[PDB]
Amino acid sequence: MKVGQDKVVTIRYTLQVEGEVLDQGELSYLHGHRNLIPGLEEALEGREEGEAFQAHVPAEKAYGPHDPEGVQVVPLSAFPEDAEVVPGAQFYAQDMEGNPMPLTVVAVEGEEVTVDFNHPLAGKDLDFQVEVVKVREATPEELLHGHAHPSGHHHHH
Numbered sequence: 060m061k062v063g064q065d066k067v068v069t070i071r072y073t074l075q076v077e078g079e080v081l082d083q084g085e086l087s088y089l090h091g092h093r094n095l096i097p098g099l100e101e102a103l104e105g106r107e108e109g110e111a112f113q114a115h116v117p118a119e120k121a122y123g124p125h126d127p128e129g130v131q132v133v134p135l136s137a138f139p140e141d142a143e144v145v146p147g148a149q150f151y152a153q154d155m156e157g158n159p160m161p162l163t164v165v166a167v168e169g170e171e172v173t174v175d176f177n178h179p180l181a182g183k184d185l186d187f188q189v190e191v192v193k194v195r196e197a198t199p200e201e202l203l204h205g206h207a208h209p210s211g212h213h214h215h216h
């Protein structure tokens with residue numbers, strides 16, 4: 060069948076940014092519920108099991124703008140006291156509610172640390188090589204959770 064709203068799709072992919080390969084592997088996801096970046100879902104939309112294609116997903120359909128207001132000054136004491144805080148250092152934090160919050164230190168002045176809160180792929184165009192491996196309809200549980208499941212293990216989130 061074809062990829063579309065509420066299918067669980069399995070893909071094999073290679074993700075390349077600026078001619079360099081960043082990730083590759085296989086995943087299943089529930090289509091039509093924001094589980095992938097919108098532009099990759101858009102390229103998958105309507106495709107049949109078996110297709111292999113290249114998709115250039117522009118920044119505005121991937122991780123969005125590198126927003127200048129995401130670059131802010133925060134105090135040194137905000138970091139663990141044994142952390143190496145120097146220009147260019149990367150940190151991987153978790154934002155109040157729990158989400159990823161990768162960050163980059165761009166400047167350090169006494170107790171003042173200039174931090175970039177933007178996602179690392181902000182403003183990057185992404186190139187995928189994709190194979191559509193499997194398309195199936197979702198179970199009621201998968202529809203209820205908003206995502207794909209591997210097997211028959213009843214659970215909650």
Ligand code: NI
Pocket residue numbers: 204206208214215216
């Ligand atoms: Ni679940």
